[PDB]
Amino acid sequence: GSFVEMVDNLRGKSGQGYYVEMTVGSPPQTLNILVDTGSSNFAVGAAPHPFLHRYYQRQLSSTYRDLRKGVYVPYTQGKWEGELGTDLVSIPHGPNVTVRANIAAITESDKFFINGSNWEGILGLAYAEIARPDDSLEPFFDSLVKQTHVPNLFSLQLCGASVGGSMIIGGIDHSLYTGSLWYTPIRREWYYEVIIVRVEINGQDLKMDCKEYNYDKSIVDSGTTNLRLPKKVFEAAVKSIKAASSTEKFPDGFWLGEQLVCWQAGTTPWNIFPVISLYLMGEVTNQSFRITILPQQYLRPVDDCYKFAISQSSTGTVMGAVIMEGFYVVFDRARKRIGFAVSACHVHDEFRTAAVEGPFVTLDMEDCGYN
Numbered sequence: 001g002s003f004v005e006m007v008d009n010l011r012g013k014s015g016q017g018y019y020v021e022m023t024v025g026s027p028p029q030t031l032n033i034l035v036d037t038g039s040s041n042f043a044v045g046a047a048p049h050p051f052l053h054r055y056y057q058r059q060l061s062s063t064y065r066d067l068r069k070g071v072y073v074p075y076t077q078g079k080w081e082g083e084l085g086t087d088l089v090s091i092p093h094g095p096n097v098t099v100r101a102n103i104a105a106i107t108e109s110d111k112f113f114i115n116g117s118n119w120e121g122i123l124g125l126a127y128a129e130i131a132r133p134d135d136s137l138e139p140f141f142d143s144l145v146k147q148t149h150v151p152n153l154f155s156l157q158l159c160g161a162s163v164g165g166s167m168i169i170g171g172i173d174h175s176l177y178t179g180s181l182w183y184t185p186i187r188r189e190w191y192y193e194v195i196i197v198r199v200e201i202n203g204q205d206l207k208m209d210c211k212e213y214n215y216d217k218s219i220v221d222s223g224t225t226n227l228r229l230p231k232k233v234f235e236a237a238v239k240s241i242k243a244a245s246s247t248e249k250f251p252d253g254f255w256l257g258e259q260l261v262c263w264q265a266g267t268t269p270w271n272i273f274p275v276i277s278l279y280l281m282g283e284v285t286n287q288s289f290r291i292t293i294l295p296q297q298y299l300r301p302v303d304d305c306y307k308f309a310i311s312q313s314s315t316g317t318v319m320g321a322v323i324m325e326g327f328y329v330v331f332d333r334a335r336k337r338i339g340f341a342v343s344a345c346h347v348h349d350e351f352r353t354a355a356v357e358g359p360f361v362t363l364d365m366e367d368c369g370y371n
C-alpha cells in the first residue's frame with residue numbers, strides 16, 4: 001500500500017538502463033546496480049575496469065565466501081566472465097533486511113559496461129531456469145524471499161525523461177498508478193514470459209495468427225530499451241505505422257533503426273503517429289485486456305532528434321522500457337502473474353494517454369503460445 005522509503009529509488013541515463021543503490025559485504029560497499037527483469041544473475045564489477053566508478057573489493061569483506069567456481073556469460077552484444085561466491089547484500093532504499101546472496105565477481109568483460117554510465121553491476125530479477133551456469137545458482141530475489149519475511153512480489157515504475165523511477169520490493173504502492181491493475185499469467189517461470197493475443201495499430205487489428213506475436217516467446221524486460229517484435233510482426237506493424245504516418249515522409253533506414261530523424265523543439269509531430277495496443281491473456285478463460293502506448297514511448301529522443309524504438313528480434317517479443325515506461329508493472333511471483341496499470345508518471349500530451357482497458361472476449365488464447 002504505502003512504501004515511501006523505496007519511492008524514487010531508481011536512477012539512470014536515457015538508453016543506459018535503470019539502476020538501484022545496493023550494498024555488498026561487511027563493512028557495506030555501495031554499488032549502483034542495473035535492475036534487469038530479463039536475466040537471473042547478480043553480477044558486479046570486481047576489478048579496476050576504466051569505465052567503472054567503483055567495484056566490489058572482496059579483500060575488504062569479512063562475510064565473503066568463495067564458491068571456487070567460475071562462469072563465462074556470452075551475449076549477442078556483450079560478454080562477461082567472473083568468479084562465483086556469496087556475501088551479505090542489502091538495498092539501502094529497500095526493505096530493512098540483509099541476505100546471503102550469490103555474487104558473480106566480474107574479472108573480465110567485453111561490451112558489457114557502458115563508458116559514461118554510473119552503474120557497476122546487474123541484478124537479474126528473473127528465475128533460476130535461465131541462471132548461469134545452471135538453475136542451481138539461486139537468484140537474488142529467491143534468496144531474499146527464502147531468508148526474510150519480504151513477500152514474493154516486486155513492482156517497477158520506470159518513468160523515463162537523466163531518468164528516474166521506483167522499485168517497490170515486497171509490495172505495491174497505489175500512488176504510482178491510476179485506475180485498476182490488470183493481470184496476465186506468467187506462462188513459465190524462466191524469463192517473465194507472457195502471451196500477446198492481439199495487436200492493434202490505432203484501433204485496427206494486424207490480423208496475424210496470434211502464434212506469430214509470441215514466436216518463440218514474449219517477455220517483460222527492464223534491461224532492453226526497445227519494444228522488440230518477431231520479424232513477421234515487425235514488418236506488419238511498420239507497414240501499418242508507415243501507412244498511419246504517411247502525412248510526413250521518412251527514410252526507410254529510420255524504421256530499421258539505422259538513421260535518426262529530426263524536427264523543431266516544441267513542435268514534434270506526435271498526432272501524425274498512431275497509438276499501439278497489445279492485448280494480453282487475462283486471468284479468466286476467453287478474457288483479455290489491452291495496454292496502449294503513445295509515440296512518446298516508442299519515439300526515443302537521442303531542436304530535437306528521435307529514434308524508432310521498435311525493432312525486429314529473433315528471440316521473440318521483448319516488452320522493454322518502451323512498454324514499461326507507460327505503466328506501473330507488478331511482478332507478482334507469488335501468484336505467477338504480471339500486473340499492468342497506467343503509470344502516474346508516464347509521458348503523454350493533452351490529446352492521448354497510455355491506457356489499461358478490459359475485459360475483452362478473446363477465444364483460443366492458449367493457441368497464441370509457441371510450443
Ligand SMILES: C[C@@]1(c2ccc(F)cc2F)CCSC(N)=N1
Pocket residue numbers: 017034036037038039075078112122221222223224
Ligand atoms: C543481461 C542483459 C543486459 C542488459 C543491459 C546491459 F547493459 C548489459 C546486459 F548484458 C543482456 C541484454 S538484454 C538483457 N535483458 N539483459
Ligand code: NA
Pocket residue numbers: 174175176177178179
Ligand atoms: Na491508484
Ligand code: NA
Pocket residue numbers: 312313314315
Ligand atoms: Na535476432
